[PDB]
């Protein structure tokens, strides 16, 4: 019962996780929050 | 000097037509031949000269074979129509009450009309009236084929038409191409650049696909974009391999 609930939480995190994009000098839409995404990937692995 | 040469220049078209109409079951074979061979001569010596016109023995043979075939189809349609309308089927009266002249005119119009220019169609119909008085040609209206053409044109953004509407002439050409494909295994679509030939045959192929349920595969070959050796094949001068 515990293992599947790990699977469902990972499922909902990764189907609701969005990259943090912000404007850069009105030229593009760059991404921040590298550390949080990387830590999430390490902890899920 | 190793061959005996014979000049075969003028075939006896009248005798050929007479015998081949007599064999197929035409009761009026003699008059039909004597009306159809001079008809082809009149077409040769009265219609406008075009590089895509042939009124020779092959055309006459195709007309006679198609006339026989459509005669069998007319006998079959009379059979089924009489069967579904009553019980009076007998070969004698049906063979006797058969428009053989109309059958011949139908074969002529199915074989010769599609290749004529726009201005020669009244010429051909005037010749038909002169040689075959009273007989009229009423082409069949292939309905399901027409709705399938409508669907194919709508799917591929093409302008369907009917009668005198915008699109009627191209649809008529598609129908004539369908008829000639049924009659002949060798097809040429002759006309100036961008006259709708490619779209016509593509639409006909897709319509036959969606109507008869058999899938049509088209191989488009440019015969002059490659050498004849690449088009037909090479025999190796050394190893004699093909």
């Amino acid at each position: 019962m515990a293992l599947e609930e790990f699977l469902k939480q990972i499922r909902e995190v990764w189907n609701t996780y969005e990259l943090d994009l912000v404007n850069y000098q009105n030229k593009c839409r760059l991404i921040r929050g590298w550390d949080d995404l990387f830590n999430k990937v390490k902890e899920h692995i | 000097k190793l061959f005996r040469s014979l000049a075969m220049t003028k075939p006896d078209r009248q005798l050929i037509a007479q015998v081949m109409l007599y064999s197929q079951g035409f009761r009026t074979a003699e008059v039909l031949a004597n009306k159809i061979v001079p008809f082809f001569k009149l077409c040769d010596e009265q219609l406008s000269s075009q590089s895509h016109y042939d009124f020779g023995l092959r055309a006459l043979k195709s007309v006679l074979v198609s006339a026989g075939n459509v005669k069998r189809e007319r006998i079959q349609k009379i059979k089924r129509e009489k069967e579904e309308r009553g019980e009076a089927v007998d070969e004698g009266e049906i063979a006797e009450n058969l428009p053989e002249q109309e059958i011949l005119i139908q074969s002529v119009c199915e074989t010769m009309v599609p290749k004529l220019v726009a201005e020669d169609i009244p010429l051909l119909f005037s010749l038909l009236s002169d040689v075959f008085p009273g007989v009229q040609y009423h082409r069949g209206e292939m309905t399901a084929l027409r709705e399938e053409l409508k669907k194919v044109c709508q799917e591929m953004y093409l302008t369907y038409g009917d009668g005198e509407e915008v699109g009627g002439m191209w649809v008529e050409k598609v129908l004539q191409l369908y008829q000639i494909t049924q009659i002949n295994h060798g097809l040429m679509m002759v006309g100036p650049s961008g006259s709708g030939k490619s779209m016509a045959w593509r639409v006909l192929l897709k319509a036959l696909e969606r109507l008869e349920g058999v899938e049509g595969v088209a191989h488009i070959i440019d015969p002059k974009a490659i050498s004849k050796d690449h088009l037909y094949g090479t025999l190796d001068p050394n190893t004699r391999e093909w």
Binding site: - | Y157, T159, V166, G167, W170, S193, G194
Partner: protein, 77 residues
Amino acid sequence: MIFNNFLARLRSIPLDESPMLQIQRDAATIMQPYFTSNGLVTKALEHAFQLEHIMDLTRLRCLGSLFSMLHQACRNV
């Protein structure tokens, strides 16, 4: 026939592969009265046949050029 085909393709197929298709429909609606029988384009094309050109004049060559640069006008918008 060709005008109807071009208008249908403009109103149906996007140029990118939607705002683009909406622009296409608006442009086709604006160009509709000109793309008609005895319209500006038809009379101009008829008159173009009377002029002399560096190569032989074909109707579909001019029509394709016109349609291509109308597509480019849509891209510009």
